[PDB]
Design a protein around this ligand. Structure first.
Ligand SMILES: C(=C/c1ccccc1)/Nc1nc2ccccc2[nH]1
Length: 460
């Protein structure tokens, strides 16, 4: 039985509105309703992995797991295995996988982050799961961010707290947050960003929705605008939205948006909004293709509609040669030439690099770089040809060209990372000097850039 080089992943997010689900929720897992939907001819074909995020979930873990498993069995005639389930308050994540994957999945982590302080601590935050699937690291975050049209900045703060403090993936990657620890990272939930138009325009918005004319609404969606201004979700992707706003509906129909201020809303308006979202971030030059992104039309117990997204995702095998794992492969090397970091910091410490990768036996520390002043004020840290030669555990090009090098630039004075990035080894050529580049972030904000050239030697 051959190891896969692609899998399909289902991501679902649903704010259940504290109500039990209806007896049939199969449309969700079939990617049927509005938006980019799945072809009928694929209905019986199971996804490899199903990741279900709920918010305002009133069910026990047992109750929800029974509903999910029975739903997937009815669709696929497959009895899915539970990889992980984690709940914070009424925020939950379930990961299910085909039984044939049970001995491909390992290093399962779970964690949660509670957002806010005092007043604002007690119901919002995030849960997450990570694991390895053969040689590929996968992370999944379900977040329920702060509600309300006039709290977009709070949502952005909630995002930064979650990516700083959620402890998933390989703890040895100590300089790196979740935005760098995984081959593929999916972040979804009730992110609670709103369509930022005047209250007086509610009926006009509803009109536009009935005409399926979303362009003038999406141009005011706070998550798209905050992302465009680099305030949140830097370096994440989202598929184009082609489905109606998923909030706020009257329950038991989808015919009516309930937007007017009520005591139950704290006297706030809930203009129709795309609260419920799926985003991803994959390492450079790894295959990832969104094959569905939409909302169901027939699940009406909540004031939100369920959202689905599905993905093709490239995966690699658990590589064994005669040499690595447990020795180097003298036939392999990675050389960095003419490298420099450009940093936005105002500090004057020396910096060194760390190179982290599962193709190395352990991370590698460089010598300190040489600080210069850039033309437009910036700090430039020059490494020249001083960087260590990296010795990968396996030299086979079928392995090595699929790997990635994480880079952290650290202060000599504090050993704190000032910036993190990632370089793909999927090069156009081996034994050839080629340009490399990554942006550098810290706490998911842009802090600089790293650029130079690489020279990769494989056994071919
Ligand atoms: C281009 C413009 C845009 C971005 C966010 C929101 C709206 C428009 N899209 C985009 N450029 C990227 C570069 C690196 C990683 C991801 C990226 N996504």
């Amino acid at each position: 039985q051959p190891e896969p080089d692609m899998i399909t992943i289902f991501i679902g997010t649903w704010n259940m509105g504290n109500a039990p689900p209806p007896k049939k929720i199969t449309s969700w897992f079939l990617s049927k309703g509005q938006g980019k939907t799945r072809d009928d001819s694929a209905d019986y074909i199971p996804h490899d992995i199903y990741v279900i995020g709920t918010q305002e979930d009133p069910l026990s873990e047992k109750e929800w797991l029974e509903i999910l498993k029975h739903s997937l069995q009815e669709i696929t005639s497959v009895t899915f295995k539970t990889v992980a389930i984690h709940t914070l308050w009424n925020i939950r994540i379930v990961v299910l996988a085909k039984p044939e994957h049970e001995n491909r999945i390992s290093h399962i982590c779970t964690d949660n982050v509670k957002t806010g302080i005092a007043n604002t601590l007690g119901n919002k935050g995030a849960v997450g799961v990570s694991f390895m699937f053969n040689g590929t690291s996968l992370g999944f975050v379900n977040s329920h961010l702060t509600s309300g049209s006039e709290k977009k900045l709070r949502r952005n703060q909630n995002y930064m707290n979650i990516l700083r403090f959620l402890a998933l993936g390989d703890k040895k990657l100590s300089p790196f947050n979740i935005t760098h620890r995984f081959t593929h990272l999916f972040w979804f939930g009730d992110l609670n960003y709103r369509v930022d138009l005047p209250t007086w325009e509610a009926e006009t918005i509803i009109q536009k929705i009935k005409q399926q004319q979303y362009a003038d609404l999406l141009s005011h969606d706070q998550l798209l605008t905050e992302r465009r201004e680099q305030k949140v979700f830097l370096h994440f992707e989202e598929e184009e939205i082609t489905f109606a706003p998923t909030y706020r509906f009257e329950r038991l129909t989808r015919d009516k948006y309930a937007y007017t201020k009520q005591k139950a809303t704290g006297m706030k308006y809930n203009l129709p909004s795309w609260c419920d979202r799926v985003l991803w971030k994959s390492y450079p030059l790894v295959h990832v293709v969104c094959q569905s992104y939409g909302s169901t039309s027939d699940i009406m117990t909540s004031d939100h509609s369920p959202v689905f997204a599905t993905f093709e995702a490239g995966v690699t095998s658990q590589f064994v040669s005669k040499n690595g794992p447990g020795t180097v492969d003298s036939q392999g090397q990675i050389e960095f030439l003419r490298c420099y970091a450009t940093l936005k910091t105002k500090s004057q410490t020396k910096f060194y690099l760390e190179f982290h990768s599962s193709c190395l036996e352990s991370f590698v520390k460089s010598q300190e770089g040489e600080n210069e002043e850039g033309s437009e004020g910036e700090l430039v840290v020059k490494f020249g040809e001083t960087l260590p030669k990296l010795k990968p555990i396996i030299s086979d090009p079928e392995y090595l060209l699929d790997q990635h090098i994480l880079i952290s630039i650290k202060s000599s004075d504090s050993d704190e990372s000032y910036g993190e990035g990632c370089i793909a080894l999927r090069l156009e050529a081996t034994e050839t000097q080629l340009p490399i580049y990554t942006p550098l972030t810290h706490h998911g904000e842009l802090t600089g850039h790293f650029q130079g050239e690489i020279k990769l030697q494989t056994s071919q």
